[PDB]
Design a protein around this nucleic acid. Structure first.
Ligand SMILES: [Zn+2]
Ligand SMILES: [Zn+2]
Ligand SMILES: [Zn+2]
Ligand SMILES: [Zn+2]
Lengths: 266, 49, 259, 49, 266, 259
RNA sequence: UUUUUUUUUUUUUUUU
RNA sequence: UUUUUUUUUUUUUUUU
RNA sequence: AAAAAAAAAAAAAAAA
RNA sequence: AAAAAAAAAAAAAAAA
């Protein structure tokens, strides 16, 4: 695996990953990955619901950085607020809610997190806006750790980037996609996508059942040439179809004797 | 009629392929004359008969 | 996929499919599809394709990036139609969803050096002009028209244009359902991303097969045959391509590999 | 020694092929982590462990 | 199946079969087989132990025919006794016992079935000679039916055969192999062979166990190069062998690490 | 046995086996083995093989019929060394066990018309002279020697020679065990007969395939190929042989049969 | 003989 | 549309 | 008796 | 609830 030693190093020149990501991507042993991490001068060594997010604000170089952090996975989003006001925070919440499903927001008791704009925006999306100390200190600790890691990444990256916004965006990209996490050895974005997909299993099943409750099927039973039906469709197979007649019977019909129609009416 | 049949075939295929690895109420079944239980398998329809 | 390698090749003999279509239909790795397409002398919608375009409304410039394969859109109000602002928007979009291909018109802002620098930094294949894919030539225009249509329905009960744009984007992404599957754009995008993630996790990439030479025993002939280039090294069998252009899967016990 | 090994290999093969479709005390077994019972299978040896 | 109509008829010219045998052999339907049977002018239309046999004597054309009948299957054997005496019956019993396993003989109370020769012969083979009315009348009825069928077949065949012994042998062959029976649609010889093979299953298993208790196996466990053993052999497979050591453990050893030896000593 | 047809053919290409050996090793029907051997230009122990021979002892003639593949023997005291007596003995033997092949020396009694008539009546392939099978050339002599050896151990406590012969035959058949399996002759004969009965029941014979022509689709060539002779008609697939000499099993959907 | 993936067994600890 | 082999179901009768 | 964690043994596949 | 027998229904393979 020595042939992967140079290229991986080049990657660490652009994206300041950690040893876990390099080991998982280039199939390198832990010791050499830790050595590569240490070789860089600018480098050292919860069970909430799916729709729980937290918000925070930080001051850096006379600029306001608003950070929205997913609690379960650690996916983060950052924005540069022009001025600290309720309108800007409400707009940022609306922008975040237009990309991911938000069902419960946690935040401190700051002056700009209680304005009428914040309440109106939270009411428009039909979400529960909670202000105060979170019930689980683990979420607060994780949010603080995420903010500190973001600040460290800005410090690492700013030397190569002229403008603050570009550095913040690059740090967000590195945090979301480059550095891996804990259980499962997955990036925060991958974990968030997996959790959202897992949560969206019952709704698709219900939608499929509702849609299948619409198709009609005409079937021929036995040697009788006369068609029969209409009947409700239960399943359609490659060889035969399974139907449920209005009387409750379950009938298997070969594909050559069944015709499926979805009427334009109703 | 032909357009309707083609469209409904496409929609049934797509909807069936949408759900392939998850369901509710996993069940066990006995197939043929073999008394040994088998499964678990996904439940498509539960009926009285 | 021992029995899938020949039959899929037969498809390329008849209809001359693409390697992407081969992966989509036969669930084959990218390397074997590339070997198949390179074997044929005649030959020489994905999860990571986006299309970005600008528009004007009430004296304000709005930039929209649309995923062609699902219909997911993202909008931003650009203070000016400059290369720096559009490059920053592209960087912000790339930090949320995976981007592997960007297409845009030949506007002056999309050609500036900032866009090229950002694309090089993010390792994104950026093309401009006529779209190479025959379809998806008007998806962005239709999405822009739809967004303009839904903005007016909410502009009445809204003060600032940015709030209206955000509300319209939210409604388009989550509150409207499409056809042939009945899925909103966000659900379709998440499903496609999950499927691609599972496939890439199974693949694990990292091939670096280079020009390793292979001697193989085909049929009942005991003499070594070839030499043939190495395409795929698997524990159960190895996939190789010959100088003539035939792709063959053979068990490891009758394959000698020389570096 | 070589003759003895060849002869004992031949005799073991022949004796094993003599009985292939009948035995006593058919038993049911669970293989791997699957809790479903399987069988019935012929009993070759029954031991304490 | 008309192409089989002529050839089958030719068979009925030589061996006077029944409709069941023709149907089972030439795959002809029942009606045409019955028609073929009727076309011939000289033609019309128990749970005992495996080692149960019966004996009888008949007089025909001034000759004595001794018939030994299997009870369970119906397999018969015939001989032409020169003079009706105990010595000839004992010799015939010895000849029959030298071909098939006999464990129980049922006869009548005749004069030649009680002589000292019969007792000595039955004692030599260690069999139970029972004289008197059989416990099950079904066996007696089946024996009488077999004798009547033998007489009928001899009458049918005698016209084409010069000597009596050849006719008797041909009738025995036709009865044993040509005409089928009841359950299972098998000839008497096939049924007898199947029953004997089924009865001989436990003894072969015991013999195999006893023989396997002799082989020795030397095996190598793990990475230790030193050989170990000797151990008792339990089973030998194409990929690996299963052994039982003297301490009671059961060990699976790959074929490349096991050597099987049967010593000349003991 | 779809995968067994080619490999078995390969054997006949290398060692030039016989059709009986092909059935014994690959469990193939007789018709396909006959087609395989016929297809080769070079080529142009069973359950029903017996060997009959006579001997003299104390002025009495004893005829012995021995099954070569198991060692089962049957003896009869012939009043005279005539053709009719030997024919009657053969008829009696054939009425108990299945006989499909009889071999004997060139003695005058085995050549007489009575033996030929009996063999024709029983439909038995009767041959005389040098045995065609390389082995089994001295089994009957060894069995005769063994019988003569064991008859002396019992002649002392016996009055009539026929009783001694019957007792010796019983002892040889049932009270002595052989090697490589540890089975007495009767058990081995019964096991072989049972196995052959099961195989023939599975086969069901009755082929009558005649010279029906077959057109087949081989590989991906759409055009009809042939014509080729028909070897075996099965529900799942059909086995055919071409005029060149290749035996191929094809699915029914790509086979057209002309009578 | 060394190293990775998978499978089958034994011992210890924490709960039900 | 007819006939054979196999598989899956329903009703009636005889025992446990 | 079931689940989880740590250690130990064997086997199969792969590279040397 | 299990076994056996008779009748009825459907499906797959094969010949026409
Ligand atoms: Zn670094
Ligand atoms: Zn091509
Ligand atoms: Zn007749
Ligand atoms: Zn040959």
């Amino acid at each position: 695996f020595v042939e992967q030693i140079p290229e991986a190093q080049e990657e660490h020149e652009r994206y300041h990953n950690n040893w876990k990501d390099l080991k998982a991507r280039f199939k390198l042993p832990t010791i050499v990955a830790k050595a590569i991490i240490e070789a860089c001068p600018k480098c050292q060594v919860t069970n909430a619901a799916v729709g729980t997010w937290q918000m925070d604000c930080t001051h850096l170089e006379g600029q306001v950085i608003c950070v929205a952090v997913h609690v379960a996975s650690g996916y983060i989003e950052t924005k540069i607020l022009p001025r600290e006001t309720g309108r800007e925070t409400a707009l940022f919440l609306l922008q975040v809610a237009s990309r991911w499903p938000i069902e419960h927001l946690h935040t401190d008791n700051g002056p700009n997190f209680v304005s009428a704009e914040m309440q109106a925006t939270a009411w428009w999306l039909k979400i529960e806006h909670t202000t105060g100390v979170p019930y689980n200190p683990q979420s607060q600790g994780s949010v603080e750790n995420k903010n500190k890691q973001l600040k460290k990444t800005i410090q690492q990256i700013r030397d190569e980037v002229q403008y603050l916004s570009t550095a913040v965006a690059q740090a967000t990209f590195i945090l979301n996609f480059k550095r891996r996490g804990g259980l499962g050895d997955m990036c925060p974005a991958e974990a968030l996508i997996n959790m959202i997909y897992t949560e969206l299993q019952t709704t698709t099943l219900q939608n499929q059942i509702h849609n299948f409750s619409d198709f009609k099927v005409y079937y021929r039973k036995g040697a009788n040439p006369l068609w029969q039906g209409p009947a409700h469709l239960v399943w359609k197979g490659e060889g035969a179809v399974v139907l449920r007649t209005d009387e409750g019977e379950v009938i298997t019909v070969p594909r050559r004797k069944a015709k499926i129609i979805k009427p334009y009416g109703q």
